[PDB]
Amino acid sequence: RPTFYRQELNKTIWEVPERYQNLSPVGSGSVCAAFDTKTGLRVAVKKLSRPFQSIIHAKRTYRELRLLKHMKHENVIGLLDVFTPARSLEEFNDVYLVTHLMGADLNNILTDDHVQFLIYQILRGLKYIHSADIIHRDLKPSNLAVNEDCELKILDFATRWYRAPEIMLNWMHYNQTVDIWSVGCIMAELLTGRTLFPGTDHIDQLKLILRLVGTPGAELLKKISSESARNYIQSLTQMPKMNFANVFIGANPLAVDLLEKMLVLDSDKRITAAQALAHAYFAQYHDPDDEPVADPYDQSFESRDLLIDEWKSLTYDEVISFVPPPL
Ligand SMILES: CC(=O)N1CCN(c2ccc(-c3nc(NCCc4ccccc4)c4ccc(N)cc4n3)cc2)CC1
Numbered sequence: 001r002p003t004f005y006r007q008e009l010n011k012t013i014w015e016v017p018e019r020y021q022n023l024s025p026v027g028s029g030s031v032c033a034a035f036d037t038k039t040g041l042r043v044a045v046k047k048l049s050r051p052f053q054s055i056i057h058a059k060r061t062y063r064e065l066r067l068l069k070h071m072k073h074e075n076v077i078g079l080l081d082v083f084t085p086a087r088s089l090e091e092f093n094d095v096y097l098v099t100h101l102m103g104a105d106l107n108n109i110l111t112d113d114h115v116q117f118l119i120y121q122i123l124r125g126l127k128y129i130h131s132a133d134i135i136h137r138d139l140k141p142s143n144l145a146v147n148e149d150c151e152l153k154i155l156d157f158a159t160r161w162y163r164a165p166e167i168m169l170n171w172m173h174y175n176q177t178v179d180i181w182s183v184g185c186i187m188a189e190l191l192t193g194r195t196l197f198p199g200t201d202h203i204d205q206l207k208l209i210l211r212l213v214g215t216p217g218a219e220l221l222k223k224i225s226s227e228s229a230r231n232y233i234q235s236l237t238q239m240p241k242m243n244f245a246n247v248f249i250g251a252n253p254l255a256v257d258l259l260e261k262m263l264v265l266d267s268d269k270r271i272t273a274a275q276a277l278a279h280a281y282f283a284q285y286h287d288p289d290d291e292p293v294a295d296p297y298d299q300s301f302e303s304r305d306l307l308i309d310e311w312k313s314l315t316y317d318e319v320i321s322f323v324p325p326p327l
Pocket residue numbers: 165166169170171172206216220223224225226228229233265266267268
């Protein structure tokens with residue numbers, strides 16, 4: 001067991017191993033930048049807020065730790081460390097997660113060669129995440145961290161602007177390509193400097209999407225199980241799919257083509273992350289021998305209904321069994 005030291009930061013007491021120095025608040029649970037004396041690198045230390053106050057929080061804490069412990073990929077945030085000051089399960093109340101400090105998010109931060117490299121890395125990270133049967137579900141520029149030489153990592157598994165239309169419309173059985181929709185929205189915004197679909201609410205959001213991609217055809221309508229959803233669709237004035245070359249004028253034609261394959265209303269026909277990596281737009285980065293998949297991820301706990309102290313004990317287990325990665 002390491003030696004801890006305590007301090008007050010903003011309104012919170014932080015108790016962390018002496019390993020971590022120079023704690024400096026970055027955001028509010030709450031995050032501090034720190035200096036990792038073991039590695040010489042800067043890290044982000046997140047202190048979770050009320051991690052076990054309810055069943056829902058307890059399961060969410062467990063879920064976040066399990067996910068972070070699983071991710072081992074250059075384009076996905078991974079867990080450098082996890083610790084608690086508690087010496088036993090009985091006094092276990094606080095959880096700290098340690099990750100690489102990334103420079104800035106993509107919302108803060110383009111040339112076509114920069115868009116190529118950034119979207120390539122997102123898709124590389126998504127191929128990995130999707131191969132574990134994990135769906136990010138909330139991809140957006142603020143969930144994409146980039147450092148100064150344009151290396152990107154996905155973290156944190158308006159919001160609505162990047163959300164797949166089948167999620168807006170409340171479909172229960174959506175697939176992993178909801179994330180590809182988000183990548184398409186992000187890529188469009190990097191190419192044009194403008195939010196693709198800046199809807200004011202959920203109905204406006206769908207109206208903006210349908211203006212670009214067109215109203216569903218009969219091929220899509222015959223797969224829609226909801227009578228109300230089918231009628232809503234067939235009630236709107238049919239819009240033709242717009243020609244993407246017209247909308248994204250002057251963009252690299254290969255980028256227009258990939259956007260056409262990502263921003264498809266029918267998610268059965270939307271391109272996958274693995275397929276997108278092989279698209280000609282990424283010709284100078286694509287390496288099928290260096291786009292790895294993930295180990296299988298046991299998601300069975302999602303279907304379980306447990307007590308607060310049970311989720312809490314399972315989380316404690318995962319803290320104790322954590323093995324730091326090689327330096
Ligand atoms: C609880 C409740 O009120 N519900 C009403 C809506 N509802 C619903 C909504 C969408 C779909 C749905 N959508 C797709 N895509 C959304 C299409 C779309 C079209 C216009 C505007 C927004 C989304 C699909 C795509 C492929 C596929 N194989 C099946 C698809 N299936 C299914 C059920 C069921 C739940």
